[PDB]
Amino acid sequence: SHHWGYGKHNGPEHWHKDFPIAKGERQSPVDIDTHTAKYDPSLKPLSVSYDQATSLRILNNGHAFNVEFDDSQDKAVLKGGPLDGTYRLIQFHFHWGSLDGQGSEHTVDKKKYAAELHLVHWNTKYGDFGKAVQQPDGLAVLGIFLKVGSAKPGLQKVVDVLDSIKTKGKSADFTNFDPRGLLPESLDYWTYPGSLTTPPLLECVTWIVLKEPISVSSEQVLKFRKLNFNGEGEPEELMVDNWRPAQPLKNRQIKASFK
Ligand SMILES: Nc1ncnc2c1ncn2[C@@H]1O[C@H](COS(N)(=O)=O)[C@@H](O)[C@H]1O
Numbered sequence: 001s002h003h004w005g006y007g008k009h010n011g012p013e014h015w016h017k018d019f020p021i022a023k024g025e026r027q028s029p030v031d032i033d034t035h036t037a038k039y040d041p042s043l044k045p046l047s048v049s050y051d052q053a054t055s056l057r058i059l060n061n062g063h064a065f066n067v068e069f070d071d072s073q074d075k076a077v078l079k080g081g082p083l084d085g086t087y088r089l090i091q092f093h094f095h096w097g098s099l100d101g102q103g104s105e106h107t108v109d110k111k112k113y114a115a116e117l118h119l120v121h122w123n124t125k126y127g128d129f130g131k132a133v134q135q136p137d138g139l140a141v142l143g144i145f146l147k148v149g150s151a152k153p154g155l156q157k158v159v160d161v162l163d164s165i166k167t168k169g170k171s172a173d174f175t176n177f178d179p180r181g182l183l184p185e186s187l188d189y190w191t192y193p194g195s196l197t198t199p200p201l202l203e204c205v206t207w208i209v210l211k212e213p214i215s216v217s218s219e220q221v222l223k224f225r226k227l228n229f230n231g232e233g234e235p236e237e238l239m240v241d242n243w244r245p246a247q248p249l250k251n252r253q254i255k256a257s258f259k
């Protein structure tokens with residue numbers, strides 16, 4: 001079994017030993033250079049259809065927390081944009097920092113945001129998530145930056161349950177959560193082909209990164225930082241700085257949906 005994390009001894013600089021694709025040709029995240037990204041007038045508009053989303057549970061996995069969805073049918077889907085076909089929402093999670101000046105995985109002109117939300121979806125043409133991750137177009141991850149300012153009302157239900165999943169392996173019922181409350185106003189985005197940003201680092205992702213951050217309050221992000229990477233009864237290691245830094249762009253083009 002693998003023992004990866006974000007520390008000096010098990011962090012991103014170590015991952016390539018168990019997961020050699022860490023040094024691959026389409027790794028994520030990347031820096032988005034806004035003056036190199038090209039507007040692609042042929043991208044179709046992005047369609048986020050989350051009205052029938054059914055959340056189930058929230059889990060501390062020792063790396064982040066995952067809000068899990070019922071993906072047994074096309075409840076909540078992502079379509080359009082760069083995507084061919086239908087991608088089903090399976091879960092969301094975040095990456096965040098120890099301080100407000102870092103925490104995002106993607107960067108924008110080298111700017112780091114306080115956190116980044118990932119809504120993970122799988123291409124329904126492959127039948128299940130495990131099959132989808134073996135395909136170069138198997139996943140679509142919708143990434144949304146967080147900055148500290150005003151509170152995000154749609155985030156508070158998440159914040160308030162974190163006390164009940166402090167440590168690795170803890171979970172709580174998390175039904176009736178509406179992920180529409182986590183979106184910014186604009187769906188303007190950048191897109192490029194990449195990977196999972198955690199082990200196993202599979203090169204199966206179409207990334208769609210929204211240009212507009214959401215604002216969350218300092219109190220909200222402070223509560224993220226009270227989580228623990230460790231298990232119950234173990235010495236406290238605060239769950240902070242669970243982000244991978246930018247990786248080499250290599251042959252890839254980042255496209256913009258907007259001028
Ligand atoms: N063994 C595995 N096989 C396939 N997928 C796996 C996985 N472990 C985690 N994920 C997935 O990879 C995501 C992390 O990558 S990210 N930050 O969204 O780019 C996790 O949230 C899981 O959905």
Ligand code: NA
Binds near residue numbers: 214215
């Ligand atoms: Na916003």
Ligand SMILES: [Zn+2]
Binds near residue numbers: 094197
């Ligand atoms: Zn992620």
